[PDB]
Design an enzyme around this catalytic site. Structure first.
Site, mmCIF file in Angstrom:
data_model
loop_
_atom_site.group_PDB
_atom_site.id
_atom_site.type_symbol
_atom_site.label_atom_id
_atom_site.label_comp_id
_atom_site.label_asym_id
_atom_site.label_seq_id
_atom_site.Cartn_x
_atom_site.Cartn_y
_atom_site.Cartn_z
ATOM 1 N N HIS A 73 -24.119 -29.574 -16.326
ATOM 2 C CA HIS A 73 -22.767 -29.803 -16.980
ATOM 3 C C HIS A 73 -21.857 -28.727 -16.527
ATOM 4 O O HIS A 73 -20.768 -28.711 -16.600
ATOM 5 C CB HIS A 73 -22.589 -30.020 -18.393
ATOM 6 C CG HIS A 73 -23.181 -28.956 -19.270
ATOM 7 N ND1 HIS A 73 -24.329 -28.841 -19.882
ATOM 8 C CD2 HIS A 73 -22.496 -27.668 -19.262
ATOM 9 C CE1 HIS A 73 -24.142 -27.690 -20.566
ATOM 10 N NE2 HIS A 73 -23.039 -26.834 -20.065
ATOM 11 N N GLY A 100 -20.023 -20.502 -23.585
ATOM 12 C CA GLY A 100 -20.638 -19.705 -22.353
ATOM 13 C C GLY A 100 -22.090 -19.498 -22.496
ATOM 14 O O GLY A 100 -22.484 -19.022 -21.561
ATOM 15 N N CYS A 130 -24.529 -21.652 -22.555
ATOM 16 C CA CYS A 130 -25.419 -22.635 -21.753
ATOM 17 C C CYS A 130 -26.248 -21.993 -20.420
ATOM 18 O O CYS A 130 -25.414 -21.204 -19.888
ATOM 19 C CB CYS A 130 -24.563 -23.981 -21.255
ATOM 20 S SG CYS A 130 -23.607 -24.703 -22.910
HETATM 21 C C1 LIG Z 1 -20.169 -30.807 -26.855
HETATM 22 O O1 LIG Z 1 -20.637 -29.961 -25.998
HETATM 23 C C2 LIG Z 1 -21.287 -30.481 -24.955
HETATM 24 C C3 LIG Z 1 -22.152 -31.681 -25.246
HETATM 25 C C4 LIG Z 1 -22.944 -32.020 -23.802
HETATM 26 C C5 LIG Z 1 -23.167 -31.107 -22.967
HETATM 27 C C6 LIG Z 1 -22.465 -29.956 -22.957
HETATM 28 C C7 LIG Z 1 -21.594 -29.764 -23.884
HETATM 29 O O2 LIG Z 1 -20.817 -28.285 -23.866
HETATM 30 C C8 LIG Z 1 -21.179 -27.328 -22.956
HETATM 31 C C9 LIG Z 1 -20.565 -26.105 -23.371
HETATM 32 N N1 LIG Z 1 -21.104 -25.727 -24.667
HETATM 33 C C10 LIG Z 1 -21.088 -24.399 -25.006
HETATM 34 O O3 LIG Z 1 -20.748 -23.746 -24.379
HETATM 35 C C11 LIG Z 1 -21.423 -24.150 -26.625
HETATM 36 C C12 LIG Z 1 -22.757 -24.050 -26.603
HETATM 37 C C13 LIG Z 1 -23.573 -23.747 -27.884
HETATM 38 O O4 LIG Z 1 -24.559 -23.757 -28.260
HETATM 39 N N2 LIG Z 1 -22.542 -23.402 -28.842
HETATM 40 C C14 LIG Z 1 -21.155 -23.344 -28.682
HETATM 41 C C15 LIG Z 1 -20.169 -23.092 -29.777
HETATM 42 C C16 LIG Z 1 -18.791 -23.254 -29.692
HETATM 43 C C17 LIG Z 1 -18.236 -23.498 -28.421
HETATM 44 C C18 LIG Z 1 -19.229 -24.100 -27.128
HETATM 45 C C19 LIG Z 1 -18.362 -24.571 -26.112
HETATM 46 C C20 LIG Z 1 -20.433 -23.881 -27.678
#
Ligand SMILES: COc1ccccc1OCCNC(=O)c1cc(=O)[nH]c2cccc(C)c12
Ligand SMILES: COc1ccccc1OCCNC(=O)c1cc(=O)[nH]c2cccc(C)c12
Lengths: 304, 304
Positions: free
Chosen positions: B41, B143, B145
Site C-alpha cells: 500500500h 507511519g 506500516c
Molecule cells: C485504513 O487504513 C488502511 C487500510 C488498509 C490498508 C492500509 C491502510 O492504512 C495505511 C496507513 N496506516 C497507518 O499508517 C496507520 C497504522 C496503524 O496501525 N495506526 C494508525 C493510526 C492512525 C493513523 C494511521 C494512518 C495509522
C-alpha cells in the site's frame, strides 16, 4: 492507536554489553569508550557476600584477574578502580559501538528500559519504573548483575541504572553508573528494609489520559475536585501527593484531551473509591503507574 | 525472580529498518540481503485506498519511483515485484547488518516482539501475541506500516509479521513476510470483521505456572478436574479448548513446579468462576494470555 508497555529499542545498548569474570564469578559489564563498568561484587565469593570488605577484596585483584570478553573477543585490562559500588576496568580498546551517551541519576517515579543480560549476552528488554521507594520490580535471574537501565533521546543513551541484586522480598536494587545505590540498599547479602512504597499518582493520571486518547472513556465522570480533596483520597489509598509541578507536567495531555487535570483527578478519585467494577482500562484491571506523562506523549506521537 | 512482558533485544532488527517512499507515501521497509520488503500500500494515495487496484497502481511505478533510505544513505532500486500484499524492492547493495534470519508464519496464540518504527527509525519495542482471531493488539500510529514482528533464537531472527493497517476497531492487521495476511483481512480501507476472539488457555496456564515459580501461589487450591470438565468452563468463559497437545506443551512447567496440568486447570477453573476477589497475580488483576509456555521457561531460565 493502542497502548503498550513499550521499551526503547535496545540496539545501542546491546553493542555495549560484555562479560566480566573475576575468579569464579561471571556477570555483565557495560563497555563505553575504553572503560568497562560492572558491579563491584564481581570480586566476591559466596563466603564474602554476608559482609564483604570490598577494599581488601579488590587489593588482592590485579588487572589480569578481570577477564573481559565482548562477544568472542577478549579485552586487555590496563587499569581498575572502584567508584562507590561499581568497578571501572580501563581497557586498551575503545568500544567501536559506543553510542552517544550520558550517565544520569533518575528520580523515583521515572521510567526506563532494562536490557536483561546473562554472560554478556542480551536476553530481553522491558520497560519499568523506579518505584518511589527506589526499588525496581524487574525480572532478573542469577547472572543478570551488570544489566543496565536506560532511556534514549534520539541518538543519545542516558544510562540510569545498573543491576546489583535481588532483595529477599523479590524486588530489585541497583545503582546509578557512578555506583551510588538508589535507595538505602547496600551490596551485602543481608535483610534490607525497602521503605513504604506508594503508587505514582502523576503516572496513573498520565495513563488515564492515554486511555482517553485511545478510546477507553468509561471512567470519565461529571465531577471535579481540588488538589487538597484529591490529596486526602491519595493519602488514604497510598498514592503520592499531587503537586502543582505534577499538574504542570500534565498540561500537554490536558490540552490534547481538553480534560482539565482536576477533572481527571476526580475520575481517579472515583476509581480509587469504587474500583473498576470488573471493567478494564487499556487492557488492565488495575490502575497502571509505569507510564510517565512524557512516555504517554511519546507513544501517542511516535518519537523515534 | 520477577515476571515481565519481555521483548527480544531489537538490535538485529534495528539494523534492517529503512524508509520507503513512493510518491507522497512514506513507510518502513525491512532490508535483508539485497531486498527491501514493505507493505504494497506504499504505492497508494488516499483516493486509492477504498478499493485499490494494486496491479494497475504498480504498473505506473518504476524502480526510480521507490525511494529507499537506510538512515542517511540512499539505496539504488534495481527491481521491484509484488508478492501477495508485500513489495520486494531489489537493491544493488546487500545490507551489511543482515542478521541470520528466517521468514516464518506463526500460529495464533504464539507471541512475538514488534519493533515499532516511523520514517525507518525505530521508536520502541514491545511483546504481543497473535490473537486467536489473527489480529494483534499493538500500539501503532500513522507511519508505522512496515514495522515487523519477530522472534530470536540465539543469532537467528525469525520474522513473522509486517504491519499493514489498523482496523476501525483499533486492533491491528498484517501479513507474514511473503505478504499473506493473517486472518481474513484485505489491504483496503473498508469495514472488516475480525472473527470472535478467545483467550489463549495454554498461555494463561503457562502464566499461572510462572506465578507459582515466582511466589504468587494464593490461587492454588485442593481441587483437580478433567480435560472435559475444564473445557465446559473454557467454553462458558470464551477460552480456547485445551487439548492433550497443550497439556504436553505444559509438561516441562508441570515438572518444574510439581503441579499436574489438570490441577492447574482446576485453579484456572476456580479463578474463571470466582474471579480474583480484588487480588493480583504477577502484578495483574486479570488472567494474562500473552506468555506462551516457551516464553515462561525462557524468562524463568535466562536464555540469551
Ligand atoms: C485504513 O487504513 C488502511 C487500510 C488498509 C490498508 C492500509 C491502510 O492504512 C495505511 C496507513 N496506516 C497507518 O499508517 C496507520 C497504522 C496503524 O496501525 N495506526 C494508525 C493510526 C492512525 C493513523 C494511521 C494512518 C495509522
Ligand atoms: C543476595 O545477593 C546479593 C546481595 C548483595 C549483592 C549481590 C548479591 O548477589 C549477586 C548475585 N545475584 C544475582 O545474580 C541475582 C540477581 C537477581 O536479580 N536475581 C537472582 C535470582 C536468583 C539468583 C540470583 C543469584 C539472582
Amino acid at each position: 492507536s493502542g497502548f503498550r508497555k513499550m521499551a526503547f529499542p535496545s540496539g545501542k545498548v546491546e553493542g555495549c554489553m560484555v562479560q566480566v569474570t573475576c575468579g569464579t564469578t561471571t556477570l555483565n559489564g557495560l563497555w563505553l569508550d575504553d572503560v568497562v563498568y560492572c558491579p563491584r561484587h564481581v570480586i566476591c565469593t559466596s563466603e564474602d557476600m554476608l559482609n564483604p570488605n570490598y577494599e581488601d577484596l579488590l587489593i588482592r585483584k590485579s588487572n589480569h584477574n578481570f577477564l573481559v570478553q565482548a562477544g568472542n573477543v577478549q579485552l586487555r585490562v590496563i587499569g581498575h578502580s572502584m567508584q562507590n559500588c561499581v568497578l571501572k576496568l580501563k581497557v586498551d580498546t575503545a568500544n567501536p559501538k559506543t553510542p552517544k551517551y550520558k550517565f544520569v541519576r533518575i528520580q523515583p517515579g521515572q521510567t526506563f528500559s532494562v536490557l536483561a543480560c546473562y554472560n554478556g549476552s542480551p536476553s530481553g528488554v522491558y520497560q519499568c519504573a523506579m518505584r518511589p521507594n527506589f526499588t525496581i520490580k524487574g525480572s532478573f535471574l542469577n547472572g543478570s548483575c551488570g544489566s543496565v537501565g536506560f532511556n534514549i533521546d534520539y541518538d543519545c543513551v542516558s544510562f540510569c541504572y545498573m543491576h546489583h541484586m535481588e532483595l529477599p522480598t523479590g524486588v530489585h536494587a541497583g545503582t546509578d553508573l557512578e555506583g551510588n545505590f538508589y535507595g538505602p540498599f547496600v551490596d551485602r547479602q543481608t535483610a534490607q528494609a525497602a521503605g513504604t512504597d506508594t503508587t505514582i499518582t502523576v503516572n496513573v493520571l498520565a495513563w488515564l489520559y492515554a486511555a482517553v486518547i485511545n478510546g477507553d472513556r468509561w471512567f470519565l465522570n461529571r465531577f471535579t475536585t481540588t488538589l487538597n480533596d484529591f490529596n486526602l483520597v491519595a493519602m488514604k489509598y497510598n498514592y503520592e501527593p499531587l503537586t502543582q509541578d505534577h499538574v504542570d507536567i500534565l498540561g500537554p495531555l490536558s490540552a490534547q484531551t481538553g480534560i482539565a487535570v482536576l477533572d481527571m483527578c476526580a475520575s481517579l478519585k472515583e476509581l480509587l473509591q469504587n474500583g473498576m467494577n470488573g471493567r478494564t482500562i487499556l487492557g488492565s484491571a488495575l490502575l497502571e503507574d509505569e507510564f510517565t506523562p512524557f512516555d504517554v506523549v511519546r507513544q501517542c506521537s511516535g518519537v523515534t
